[PDB]
């Protein structure tokens, strides 16, 4: 009994920590994903600007002729 | 007495399988975190370079418009 | 200047190979430091929870003494 | 062939220029990250002091009974 109860209390506590850690990690995996999503939207906006500015320069050179 | 130990034995094996799965999840969760952090460092580097392209082409606009 | 270019292009081709090897080395170092920061973040959450844990025990003790006063 | 070598030569020199510019950019980013790690170290060190302090206040408070 004595070895069996000790291990039962050990593993129950072990799992108790993993579960807490697992839920803590959901929060961290959620935060990091959104941060990435913010960095993707920043890139997407700049990609539009680069396309526009090149077009404006192309039009302005063409108007110069 | 015998039932209580059988119940523990059974419970202890289920917990050693639960511990095994959480430890597999852990190292799996580490590699994802590593992957997603690197992707952020690539996306930040893109922004640096994309901002550079905007300032480059806006400078070119400035110079033409003033030279005109 | 033809042979000068042939010599230089070979030597630059070697230099680009080293730069490319430096780059993947810089990736590995960046990745090591980023996870070390994530290992430190989780330690902060662990430590804060432990502060919370003891402060609860403090509060309970003090509150339980208030009743017995 | 010499035309082909001069093109090649310009591209390799370009390649090198970008590697040398990425090199120097990375130094700043690593230095930034390395300080951000120091800020997180300092926050661990502060909290470890509080964990030690709270445990010791709990111990003396129980002794006060």
UniProtKB/Swiss-Prot annotation, chain A:
Region annotated Ubiquitin-binding domain (UBD), chain positions: 1-59
Impact noted for substituting residue 21 to N: Abolishes interaction with polyubiquitinated IRAK1
Subcellular location per the Swiss-Prot or TrEMBL entry: Cytoplasm; Nucleus
Reported phenotype of the disruption mutant: Embryonic lethal. Mice develop an inflammatory disease with characteristics of human systemic lupus erythematosus (SLE), including the appearance of immature granulocytes in the peripheral blood and development of autoreactive antibodies and glomerulonephrititis.
Expression by tissue: Ubiquitous. Abundant in heart and skeletal muscle and expressed at lower levels in thymus, liver, kidney, brain and intestinal tract.
Role, per record: Inhibits NF-kappa-B activation and TNF-induced NF-kappa-B-dependent gene expression by regulating TAX1BP1 and A20/TNFAIP3-mediated deubiquitination of IKBKG; proposed to link A20/TNFAIP3 to ubiquitinated IKBKG. Involved in regulation of EGF-induced ERK1/ERK2 signaling pathway; blocks MAPK3/MAPK1 nuclear translocation and MAPK1-dependent transcription. Increases cell surface CD4(T4) antigen expression. Involved in the anti-inflammatory response of macrophages and positively regulates TLR-induced activation of CEBPB.
Subunit structure: Interacts with TNFAIP3 and IKBKG (polyubiquitinated); facilitates TNFAIP3-mediated de-ubiquitination of NEMO/IKBKG. Interacts with polyubiquitin. Interacts with MAPK1, SELPLG and PIK3CD. Interacts with IRAK1 (polyubiquitinated). Interacts with MYD88; the interaction is indicative for participation in an activated TLR-signaling complex. Interacts with TAX1BP1.
Name of this protein: TNFAIP3-interacting protein 1
Organism: Mus musculus
């Amino acid at each position: 009994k004595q070895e069996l109860v000790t291990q039962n209390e050990l593993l129950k506590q072990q799992v108790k920590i993993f579960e807490e850690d697992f839920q803590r990690e959901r929060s961290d995996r959620e935060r990091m994903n959104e941060e990435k999503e913010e960095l993707k939207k920043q890139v997407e906006k700049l990609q539009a600007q680069v396309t526009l500015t090149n077009a404006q320069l192309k039009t302005l050179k063409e108007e110069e002729k």
